[PDB]
C-alpha cells in the first residue's frame, strides 16, 4: 500500500467509504501513530509519552486525546473525525494500541484494546437542538444524568452451541441495533434452539444512562 500524500481529495467519495477503504485507512493509521509519537506541548514536553505512561502505570485501558491538539497538529484527521466517527475511532484505537505496545511491550497482559476518547470537541450542541443533520456524527452535549442502569454484561462477540451436534457457531458481532440470530449450523444446517457458549463468548460492560437538560438551562414552567 503506497503512502497517500493527500487524504483531503475525497475524489467524489463520502468520508465514510473513503476512510473505510484500505489506502486512506493505512494513511490515517500512520498519521495518528506519528501524531501520538511526536506531538509536543508549548514547553516542548512530549505530552502523550506522559499520558500513555500514566495510563500504563494505572492500568486504565483508555487514552484521552485533546481535539484541539489533534486539530492543531494533524488537520485532516480532525476533519474526518466528526464526519465518520465510528470508523476513525476504530482506526485510532488500533494505532494507539500499536504505540502503547511500543512503549510497554508486556501491556497485552493487562489489555487487548485501547479506547481513544476525544475531549474539547468544538461541536457543542444543546439537547433541545439535536436534529437529523447530526445523525452518525460526533456531537458534544451537556445535561444532568437522571437515570442509570446497573453495569450489565452485553454480548460483543458471541458464539453459539449447535442445538444437535457439538459444533460452535462463528463469532458474530453485536450491533446495539437488534438481537443477533445465529442462522443455521454450517456443519449440519440445523436452525433450532441455539444457546450461548458463555465460556467462549466475549462480553463487554454495558450501562444505559438517561440525561436531560440541566434545570437551570431549561425555561421556567
Amino acid at each position: 500500500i503506497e503512502s497517500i500524500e493527500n487524504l483531503e481529495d475525497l475524489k467524489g467519495h463520502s468520508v465514510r467509504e473513503w476512510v473505510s477503504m484500505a489506502g486512506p485507512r493505512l494513511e490515517i493509521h500512520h498519521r495518528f501513530k506519528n501524531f501520538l509519537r511526536t506531538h509536543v506541548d508549548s514547553h516542548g514536553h512530549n505530552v502523550f509519552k506522559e499520558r500513555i505512561s500514566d495510563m500504563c502505570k494505572e492500568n486504565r485501558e483508555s487514552l484521552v486525546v485533546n481535539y484541539e491538539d489533534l486539530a492543531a497538529r494533524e488537520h485532516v484527521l480532525a476533519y474526518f473525525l466528526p464526519e465518520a466517527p465510528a470508523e476513525l475511532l476504530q482506526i485510532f484505537d488500533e494505532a494507539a494500541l500499536e504505540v502503547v505496545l511500543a512503549m510497554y511491550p508486556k501491556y497485552d497482559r493487562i489489555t487487548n484494546h485501547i479506547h481513544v476518547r476525544i475531549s474539547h470537541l468544538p461541536l457543542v450542541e444543546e439537547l433541545r437542538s439535536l436534529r437529523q443533520l447530526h445523525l452518525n456524527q460526533l456531537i458534544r452535549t451537556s445535561g444532568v444524568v437522571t437515570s442509570c442502569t446497573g453495569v450489565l454484561p452485553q454480548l460483543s462477540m458471541v458464539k453459539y452451541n449447535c442445538n444437535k451436534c457439538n459444533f460452535v457457531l462463528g463469532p458474530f458481532c453485536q450491533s446495539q441495533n437488534q438481537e443477533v440470530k445465529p442462522g443455521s449450523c454450517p456443519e449440519c444446517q440445523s436452525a433450532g434452539p441455539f444457546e450461548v457458549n458463555m465460556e467462549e463468548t466475549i462480553y463487554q460492560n454495558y450501562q444505559r444512562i438517561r440525561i436531560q437538560e440541566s434545570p437551570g438551562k431549561v425555561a421556567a414552567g
Binding site: 459444533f167 437488534q178 440470530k181 442462522g183 454450517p186 444446517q189 440445523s190
Partner: protein, 382 residues
Amino acid sequence: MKLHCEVEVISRHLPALGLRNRGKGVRAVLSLCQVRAFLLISTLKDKRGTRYELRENIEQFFTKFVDEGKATVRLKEPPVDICLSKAISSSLKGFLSAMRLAHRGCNVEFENFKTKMVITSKKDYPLSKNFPYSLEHLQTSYCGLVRVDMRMLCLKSLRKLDLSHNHIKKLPATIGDLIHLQELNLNDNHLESFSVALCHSTLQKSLRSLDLSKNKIKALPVQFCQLQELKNLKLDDNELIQFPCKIGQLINLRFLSAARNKLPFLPSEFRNLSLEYLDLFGNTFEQPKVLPVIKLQAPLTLLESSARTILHIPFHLCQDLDTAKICVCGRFCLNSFIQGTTTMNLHSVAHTVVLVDNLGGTEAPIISYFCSLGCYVNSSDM
C-alpha cells in the same frame, strides 16, 4: 460434472442483522460451466439459473457430514453461503473437487414424479406397466382383482398400498418383499385369511398400519404377533371369532377397531396392551360367570412349558412360547394349562373406549389363569 440436489443460498448478512433463513432446501441442479469458470444454480423458480463467480473467491468448505446424513457443504463466499441439503456422496465429492480446482483457477433437468397415484376403477385406467418404478404410494379401489398382481408387487419403494373395495379373495406371500411398506389396506375385500407366511417378511419390521375390515376372516394366524411395528389395526365388520393369543407382543399398537365381530372373550395377554383407542362395539361377548376351568394334573410337560417361558428355531419351543399360559399365570405358577375366564375393564388398556354394550357396558370377559387365589376369586365370582 453437474450435480442434482436440494440447495439453500443464505446471504451472510442475515444472522448478524438478526434475520432468520428459511431452514430447508429447494430442489435444484448445480452446473460448473466455463472462458472463465461459473457456478450455475437452477431451481423450479428459475430454469435460467443464477451464476456465481468462483475464479478466486471461495471462502471455505464444510465437510463433516459429506456422508449425506443431515448433510451440507455450507460453501461460503463473498458474501453468500451455499448449502446442499441432500445429494449422493460420490458425485458430491467429485463436484467439490471440481469446485476446488476452479477456485485454484490456474487449471480449468430436475424432473420428478410424485409419491402418489390413484385408480378409482380399472375401467377408467388400468395399472398396466406404466407405473413409475420407485412409486411410494398407490390407491386401487372398486377393481376386480381376485389376487394382488406383480404390477404393484414389483414397485421398489412403496410406503402405502391400498386395495380397499377391490374383490381380493387371497393375497400373496411376495407382497412382503416391499421393504418400506408402512400402510396396507384391504377394506371391503373378500379375504378368507391374512397371509400366514407374510408375517415374517419385510412387513415384520416396517408395517405401521393394517386394515382388514369388511372381510370374512374368522381368525388371524397366531404368528400375526410378529407384526410388532404395527401401530394401527382395523378388523371390524369381520367374522373374527378370536384375536391371536400373542396379541400382547404388539407393543407399538395404539389404535384397535374390531367392532361387530364374533369375539366371545379377549385373550389373556390383552391386559398387556397400552392402546389410545379401542372399539369393540356389538361383538356379542359372553355374559355368564360360569367356571369351566381346565385342570392340569401337574405333568412334567406342562410344568416345563410353563417354567421355560420365564428363561427362554426350535418349533417345539416356539409352540411352548405360544402356549405359555401367560408364564403359567402371574402367581403361584404350576403349569401352563390352568385356564378360565374373568371380567376386565377396558380403561385398563385404552384411554378412549367405545362402550361395547349398553348398561354401563365398559367391560368384557377375558381369558384368565387360576392358580390358588385366582381360583378362589373365580369361585367367589361364580
